Amino acid sequence: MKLNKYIDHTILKPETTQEQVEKILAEAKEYDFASVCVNPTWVALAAESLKDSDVKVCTVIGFPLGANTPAVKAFETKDAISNGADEIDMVINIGALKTGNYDLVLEDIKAVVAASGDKLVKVIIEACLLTDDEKVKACQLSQEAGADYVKTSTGFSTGGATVADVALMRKTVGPDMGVKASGGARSYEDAIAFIEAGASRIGASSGVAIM
Amino acid sequence: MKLNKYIDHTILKPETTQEQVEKILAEAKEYDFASVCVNPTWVALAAESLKDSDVKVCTVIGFPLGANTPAVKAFETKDAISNGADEIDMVINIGALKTGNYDLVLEDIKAVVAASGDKLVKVIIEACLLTDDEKVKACQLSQEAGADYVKTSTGFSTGGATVADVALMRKTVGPDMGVKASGGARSYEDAIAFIEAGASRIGASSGVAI
Numbered sequence: 071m072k073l074n075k076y077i078d079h080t081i082l083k084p085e086t087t088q089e090q091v092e093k094i095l096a097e098a099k100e101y102d103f104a105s106v107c108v109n110p111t112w113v114a115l116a117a118e119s120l121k122d123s124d125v126k127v128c129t130v131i132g133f134p135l136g137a138n139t140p141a142v143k144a145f146e147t148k149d150a151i152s153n154g155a156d157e158i159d160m161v162i163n164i165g166a167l168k169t170g171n172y173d174l175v176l177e178d179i180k181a182v183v184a185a186s187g188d189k190l191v192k193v194i195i196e197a198c199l200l201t202d203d204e205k206v207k208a209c210q211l212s213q214e215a216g217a218d219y220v221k222t223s224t225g226f227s228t229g230g231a232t233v234a235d236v237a238l239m240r241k242t243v244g245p246d247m248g249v250k251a252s253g254g255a256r257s258y259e260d261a262i263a264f265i266e267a268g269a270s271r272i273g274a275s276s277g278v279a280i281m
Numbered sequence: 282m283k284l285n286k287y288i289d290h291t292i293l294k295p296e297t298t299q300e301q302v303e304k305i306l307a308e309a310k311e312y313d314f315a316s317v318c319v320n321p322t323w324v325a326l327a328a329e330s331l332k333d334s335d336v337k338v339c340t341v342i343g344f345p346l347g348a349n350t351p352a353v354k355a356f357e358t359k360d361a362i363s364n365g366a367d368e369i370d371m372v373i374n375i376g377a378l379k380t381g382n383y384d385l386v387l388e389d390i391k392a393v394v395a396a397s398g399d400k401l402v403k404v405i406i407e408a409c410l411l412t413d414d415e416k417v418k419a420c421q422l423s424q425e426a427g428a429d430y431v432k433t434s435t436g437f438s439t440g441g442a443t444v445a446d447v448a449l450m451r452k453t454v455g456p457d458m459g460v461k462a463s464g465g466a467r468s469y470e471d472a473i474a475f476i477e478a479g480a481s482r483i484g485a486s487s488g489v490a491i
Binding site for chain 1: 293295296297298299300320321322323324344345346347348349350352353356357360361364372374375376377379380382385407410437438
């Protein structure tokens with residue numbers, strides 16, 4: 071089985087300083103978390119702090135609005151990986167998905183996956199701006215582009231993960247692609263509620279959850 | 282008497298659809314605004330719509346958190362300009378400025394200006410997350426890196442432009458670098474209030490006023 075290797079220890083506020091990032095890295099090594107999630111500007115720093123641990127380095131791409139061009143997303147993924155990243159959470163082009171531009175949405179994710187290398191790629195759908203049908207379509211599109219995970223939220227919008235959304239995403243995408251619940255889960259029962267819902271990973275700043 | 286050329290007609294929300302941007306473009310052509318401000322994915326479309334007009338195309342880089350690497354910011358600017366962009370609002374590395382990493386901040390802005398070309402670059406400082414001294418320092422650093430403007434806000438944080446912040450910024454950058462008040466901005470009197478405090482530009486979504 072598994073235990074806390076469901077947790078991505080996350081710090082992403084724009085005003086986050088190095089000492090804060092370092093306290094996050096400390097906490098991550100201490101409770102052997104799955105990874106830390108930081109903005110690109112800290113990936114290098116995180117890498118060198120997290121070598122000699124099984125704690126991977128996770129960063130976010132086209133974050134949190136996902137309204138960058140596919141080329142730019144690709145170059146930022148290649149740059150993050152060349153800096154130490156072991157995982158990539160991109161934000162789907164929500165505007166394109168809302169227009170009906172499935173071609174561009176798919177081209178978008180595929181550019182990131184093509185620049186991925188051998189690295190794990192999660193696609194943030196941000197379920198709170200979508201209809202149920204658009205959640206389904208987003209998961210299908212991310213999986214058609216051949217990505218590794220679908221993530222519910224950037225935590226910078228109106229809502230985070232809901233159990234119903236996690237379930238819908240899991241029913242949609244199957245049990246061989248992952249689903250990360252990434253919003254407003256701040257306590258142990260929240261985490262197990264999400265895990266029992268279908269979630270293989272959890273994003274949060276609250277590593278210290280019953281633990 | 283007459284504010285249309287002070288206005289960047291802006292739409293930046295993540296869920297923005299093509300019809301919404303096309304309406305923003307329509308209104309921009311209609312009241313002859315200074316420019317439109319959209320995310321990179323819409324630059325091509327805006328460019329082709331604003332062809333044959335007095336309305337420039339503005340987009341945003343490292344938006345709205347400014348926590349990307351300098352390399353990617355330079356690349357995104359070079360891509361935006363390669364798509365049709367005429368003006369670039371980059372976000373300062375707020376976290377680095379908060380650490381004390383003035384070198385990385387300056388390196389960041391300098392990278393963006395280096396890929397700028399002959400194009401106008403505005404630097405968003407995000408004055409709602411800074412102390413007064415940090416607003417000043419952000420402006421000084423953005424002016425030494427040789428950018429063309431300082432902008433108050435990304436409209437995606439806790440606060441927007443205040444008259445005190447604009448005034449302080451103009452005082453810092455002298456009167457030949459620009460100052461854009463963003464996220465004020467809801468009325469005619471709001472706009473002239475920001476202009477009289479020393480803004481050469483205004484960002485808002487309520488351009489239609491008047």
